[PDB]
Design a protein around this ligand. Structure first.
Ligand SMILES: CC[C@H](C)[C@H](N)C(=O)O
Ligand SMILES: [Cl-]
Ligand SMILES: [Cl-]
Ligand SMILES: [Mg+2]
Ligand SMILES: [Mg+2]
Ligand SMILES: [Mg+2]
Length: 348
């Protein structure tokens, strides 16, 4: 027999770069585990569903995975809105759901069936404030945020709380926008030392593109939403200079053997570079597979995940606390000409 595992990922739509990276990293882990004999001698059977980057679809897909497909665990969604919309449906069926990358604070509170593989937005905002203040030496900044996003708003809230310099402009945009001219024009005529942009790649990359196009050269700093090659494609490699952003995976600073092995394996399998989201998803599959060893049913997989205190993976350790959260190493990436040239370990 087999062990059924569902994927619920943003494989198409506005968040596709994130979910597709996770699909690739998760599938690589499954393939390897299967080649090595499966779990308890059972092959992993994947039911891979695309949530289209939509919250209602993420919810519907979860119901179908847990009640029709009758999967034992779900990996994904990648993003916070979708994860928040999926959790109650997994919970009703008593199936654990692990999001490799949903950073919304408090998402796991009281959620016996939700696990989060990454850090939180409060942590991101604090790191951004510390970095722009102490490393970019910024006494004045522009804050430009996706107002249609709880993710972006959470990072912005934390940033404002921590930052002691002057926010000279606190402007907005919304997901789906493709024109940022008015706001950028308004910013240009003001002295500032950096622009902090909480948001996702479709908007952030276009913002970088347009800012640099109109002569704004100062540092543009983002949260984890800046990861991936689609951000660089939107910005264009030329304009993707003086860019800094948070990541949970680095190929150069304090690089572990597991990170090296994953980079090599992903390149061999896909002939592409992995993002931090592929790395987190690869670890999430291993966390579930390990938890499935000796598990008689889905509640036991959940219990076993909750007892995971010392897992070592591609993204360092995973050690779940009582709230199903794990501390994770974070890096501030330095990007020029669309390439990461430096990585610095950072913490609040
Ligand atoms: C892919 C994850 C994204 C960038 C974000 N951390 C979220 O929670 O929505
Ligand atoms: Cl553009
Ligand atoms: Cl400038
Ligand atoms: Mg398929
Ligand atoms: Mg000045
Ligand atoms: Mg090899």
């Amino acid at each position: 027999k087999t062990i059924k595992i569902g994927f619920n990922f943003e494989e198409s739509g506005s968040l596709a770069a994130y979910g597709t990276a996770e699909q690739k990293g998760a599938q690589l882990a499954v393939d390897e585990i299967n080649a090595a004999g499966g779990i308890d001698g059972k092959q992993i059977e994947v039911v891979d569903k695309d949530n289209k980057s939509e919250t209602a679809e993420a919810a519907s897909v979860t119901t179908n995975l847990v009640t029709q497909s009758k999967v034992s665990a779900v990996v994904g969604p990648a993003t916070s809105g979708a994860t928040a919309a999926a959790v109650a449906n997994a919970t009703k069926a008593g199936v654990p759901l692990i999001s490799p990358s949903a950073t919304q604070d408090g998402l796991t509170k009281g959620q016996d069936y939700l696990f989060i593989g990454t850090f939180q937005d409060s942590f991101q905002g604090k790191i951004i404030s510390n970095y722009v203040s102490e490393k970019l030496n910024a006494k004045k900044v522009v804050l430009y945020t996706d107002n249609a996003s709880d993710y972006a708003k959470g990072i912005a809230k934390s940033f404002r709380e921590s930052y002691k310099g002057e926010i000279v402009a606190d402007e907005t945009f919304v997901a789906g926008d493709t024109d940022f001219q008015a706001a950028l024009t308004k910013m240009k005529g003001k002295d500032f030392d950096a622009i902090v942009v909480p948001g996702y790649y479709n908007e952030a990359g276009k913002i970088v593109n347009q800012a640099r196009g109109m002569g704004i050269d100062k540092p543009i700093v983002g949260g984890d939403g800046f990861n991936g090659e689609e951000f660089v494609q939107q910005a264009t490699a030329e304009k993707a200079s003086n860019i800094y952003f948070i990541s949970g995976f680095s190929t150069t600073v304090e690089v572990s053997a597991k990170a090296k092995a994953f980079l090599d394996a992903y390149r061999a399998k896909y002939n592409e570079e992995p993002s931090t989201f592929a790395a987190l998803a690869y670890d999430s599959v291993h966390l579930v597979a390990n938890a499935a060893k000796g598990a008689k049913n889905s509640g036991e997989i959940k219990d076993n995940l909750a007892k995971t205190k010392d897992f070592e993976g591609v993204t360092g350790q995973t050690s779940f606390d009582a709230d199903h959260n794990t501390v994770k190493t974070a890096y501030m990436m330095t990007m020029n000409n669309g390439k990461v040239e430096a990585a610095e370990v950072v913490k609040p």
